[PDB]
Amino acid sequence: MNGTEGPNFYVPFSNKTGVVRSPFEAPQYYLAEPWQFSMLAAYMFLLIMLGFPINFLTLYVTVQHKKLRTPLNYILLNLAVADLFMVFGGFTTTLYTSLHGYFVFGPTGCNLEGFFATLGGEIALWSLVVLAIERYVVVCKPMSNFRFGENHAIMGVAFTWVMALACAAPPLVGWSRYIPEGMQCSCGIDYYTPHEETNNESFVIYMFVVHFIIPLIVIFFCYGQLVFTVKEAAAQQQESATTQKAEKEVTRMVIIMVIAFLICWLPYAGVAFYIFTHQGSDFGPIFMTIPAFFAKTSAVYNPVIYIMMNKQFRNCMVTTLCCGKNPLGDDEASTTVSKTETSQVAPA
Ligand SMILES: *[C@@H]1O[C@H](CO)[C@@H](O[C@@H]2O[C@H](CO)[C@@H](O[C@@H]3O[C@H](CO)[C@@H](O)[C@H](O)[C@@H]3O)[C@H](O)[C@H]2NC(C)=O)[C@H](O)[C@H]1NC(C)=O
Ligand SMILES: *[C@@H]1O[C@H](CO)[C@@H](O[C@@H]2O[C@H](CO)[C@@H](O)[C@H](O)[C@H]2NC(C)=O)[C@H](O)[C@H]1NC(C)=O
Ligand SMILES: *C/C=C(C)/C=C\C=C(C)\C=C\C1=C(C)CCCC1(C)C
Numbered sequence: 001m002n003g004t005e006g007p008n009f010y011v012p013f014s015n016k017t018g019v020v021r022s023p024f025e026a027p028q029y030y031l032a033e034p035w036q037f038s039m040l041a042a043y044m045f046l047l048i049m050l051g052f053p054i055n056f057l058t059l060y061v062t063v064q065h066k067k068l069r070t071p072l073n074y075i076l077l078n079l080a081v082a083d084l085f086m087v088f089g090g091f092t093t094t095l096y097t098s099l100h101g102y103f104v105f106g107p108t109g110c111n112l113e114g115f116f117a118t119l120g121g122e123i124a125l126w127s128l129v130v131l132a133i134e135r136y137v138v139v140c141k142p143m144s145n146f147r148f149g150e151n152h153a154i155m156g157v158a159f160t161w162v163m164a165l166a167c168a169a170p171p172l173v174g175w176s177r178y179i180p181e182g183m184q185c186s187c188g189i190d191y192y193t194p195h196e197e198t199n200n201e202s203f204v205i206y207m208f209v210v211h212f213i214i215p216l217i218v219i220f221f222c223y224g225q226l227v228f229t230v231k232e233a234a235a236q237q238q239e240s241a242t243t244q245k246a247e248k249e250v251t252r253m254v255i256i257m258v259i260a261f262l263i264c265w266l267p268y269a270g271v272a273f274y275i276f277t278h279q280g281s282d283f284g285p286i287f288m289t290i291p292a293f294f295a296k297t298s299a300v301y302n303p304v305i306y307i308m309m310n311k312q313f314r315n316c317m318v319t320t321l322c323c324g325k326n327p328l329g330d331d332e333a334s335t336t337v338s339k340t341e342t343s344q345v346a347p348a
């Protein structure tokens with residue numbers, strides 16, 4: 001056999017030398033150099049140190065500034081929240097695991113590690129669908145006099161969680177299961193064994209279709225619409241009203257957010273589809289380790305795109321960090337928001 005199947009795991013190493021141990025009972029240093037596990041640990045340490053403050057700050061500024069209530073401001077607030085669950089929900093265990101070379105917390109630690117990475121990745125995938133919809137409704141404007149309200153945005157947010165939970169929770173209650181991957185310091189969906197006893201195969205097809213292919217189809221089809229209507233081409237203020245030039249900034253960001261999502265999950269998705277379609281083939285530990293741990297960056301890149309591609313939010317963050325206020329130079333050069341500085345309402 002090319003690997004060592006356990007009743008609870010599947011180590012990507014031969015046990016012909018009888019040196020393979022359950023990833024829930026002993027270190028896996030026989031799979032790789034011990035310094036490489038330290039690498040993983042240092043890496044997770046740094047991700048947590050980056051992920052916590054970046055997402056918390058994003059969360060804090062959105063709340064402290066009353067006028068930050070567009071659908072985009074909601075989705076990113078929702079993302080930072082999801083990202084914080086990733087950091088404290090799963091990254092804390094993946095760091096603890098990497099430090100010991102195996103899941104000392106047994107299957108529970110594996111469920112935490114896998115559930116939160118999945119939840120987070122999916123909340124983002126579905127958040128992209130919503131954003132793609134919202135972006136469609138404002139650019140191609142399917143209605144005549146319509147505008148999304150805080151109510152609709154909260155609906156979208158509630159939606160992403162329902163969809164994400166529909167993908168990450170089944171494995172905690174009998175449909176498929178979370179299992180250690182690569183160097184066995186991270187956990188994911190069981191693509192390794194057929195374990196009919198928990199219907200692993202049907203869940204995988206369900207995950208790749210309902211929670212990967214379909215959403216991407218929607219997203220790319222919707223984009224194909226904003227091919228003619230709007231475009232990445234943006235000049236100075238106006239074009240068709242300054243409300244058009246500013247509307248373009250948000251769309252440019254949403255498109256980048258998709259590029260990033262793909263760059264972060266296509267390799268993990270790719271190696272997972274392979275394994276699933278080559279169960280028992282001869283692949284080693286590093287195979288899934290690299291894409292799996294790289295995908296964990298999904299917990300901090302969104303807020304970075306937000307702050308770097310949204311003049312308004314960035315100015316609000318500066319105003320928050322510089323205490324009282326003092327946005328210096330630009331300030332925004334457009335409408336702004338906060339809790340007492342200049343959140344003055346400006347309708348009619
Ligand atoms: C890879 O092959 C080796 C050798 O066949 C497997 O080692 C065996 O592992 C089991 C469980 O870890 C050992 O059983 C132990 O028996 C004592 C009874 O004295 C019990 O108190 C312990 O709780 C445990 O059940 C067994 O002795 C050991 N045999 C060896 C080293 O020759 C190893 O499990 C295989 N890797 C897999 C399939 O994960
Ligand atoms: C162990 O892994 C090897 C290589 O991944 C598997 O051998 C391949 O099997 C497929 C389908 O049977 C063939 O198309 C390839 O040509 C084989 N490659 C080799 C080794 O030349 C092998 O089947 C696996 N053993 C199992 C299933 O336990
Ligand atoms: C480090 C931990 C990881 C990567 C844990 C598990 C993650 C998954 C099973 C993620 C699945 C998928 C997502 C989030 C994005 C679209 C493709 C997908 C279905 C492979």
Ligand SMILES: CCCCCCCS[C@@H]1O[C@H](CO)[C@@H](O)[C@H](O)[C@H]1O
Pocket residue numbers: 266267268269270271274282283284287
């Ligand atoms: C970017 C998505 C990644 C696509 C997945 C490529 C699987 S490729 C696969 O990998 C095995 C293990 O290293 C090799 O032994 C085998 O020769 C190779 O063809």
Ligand SMILES: CCCCCCCS[C@@H]1O[C@H](CO)[C@@H](O)[C@H](O)[C@H]1O
Pocket residue numbers: 249252253256304305308309310
């Ligand atoms: C860190 C993610 C950002 C890097 C990806 C390239 C985004 S693109 C970049 O966005 C700026 C603000 O929206 C625009 O002013 C600029 O013209 C445009 O090229």
Ligand SMILES: *C(=O)CCCCCCCCCCCCCCC
Pocket residue numbers: 052053054056057318321322323
């Ligand atoms: C205004 O006074 C000048 C800008 C100074 C901002 C310095 C940037 C440091 C960012 C640290 C924020 C940490 C977030 C807190 C998480 C608890």
Ligand SMILES: *C(=O)CCCCCCCCCCCCCCC
Pocket residue numbers: 321322323324
């Ligand atoms: C409100 O306006 C406070 C600003 C918060 C930004 C944090 C700025 C940190 C101050 C610089 C510290 C200098 C480093 C010296 C270390 C000995």
Ligand SMILES: C=CC/C=C/C=C/CCCCCCCCC
Pocket residue numbers: 043046047050256259260297300301304305
């Ligand atoms: C088109 C791409 C937009 C890309 C954006 C990226 C923003 C990224 C943050 C990634 C943080 C990784 C940290 C590793 C610390 C060892």
Ligand SMILES: CC(=O)/C=C/C1=C(C)CCCC1(C)C
Pocket residue numbers: 283284285286287288290
């Ligand atoms: C795919 C990848 O980046 C590395 C693949 C591998 C190498 C180089 C060494 C042993 C086996 C494994 C883990 C398959």
Ligand SMILES: [Hg+2]
Pocket residue numbers: 131132133135136219222223226
């Ligand atoms: Hg779109």
Ligand SMILES: [Hg+2]
Pocket residue numbers: 260263264265294295297298301
């Ligand atoms: Hg990424």
Ligand SMILES: [Hg+2]
Pocket residue numbers: 312313315316317332335336337
């Ligand atoms: Hg602002």
Ligand SMILES: [Zn+2]
Pocket residue numbers: 007195197
């Ligand atoms: Zn079983």
Ligand SMILES: [Zn+2]
Pocket residue numbers: 122163164165166167168211
């Ligand atoms: Zn989902």
Ligand SMILES: [Zn+2]
Pocket residue numbers: 194201276279
């Ligand atoms: Zn199969």
Ligand SMILES: [Zn+2]
Pocket residue numbers: 329330331332
């Ligand atoms: Zn500026």
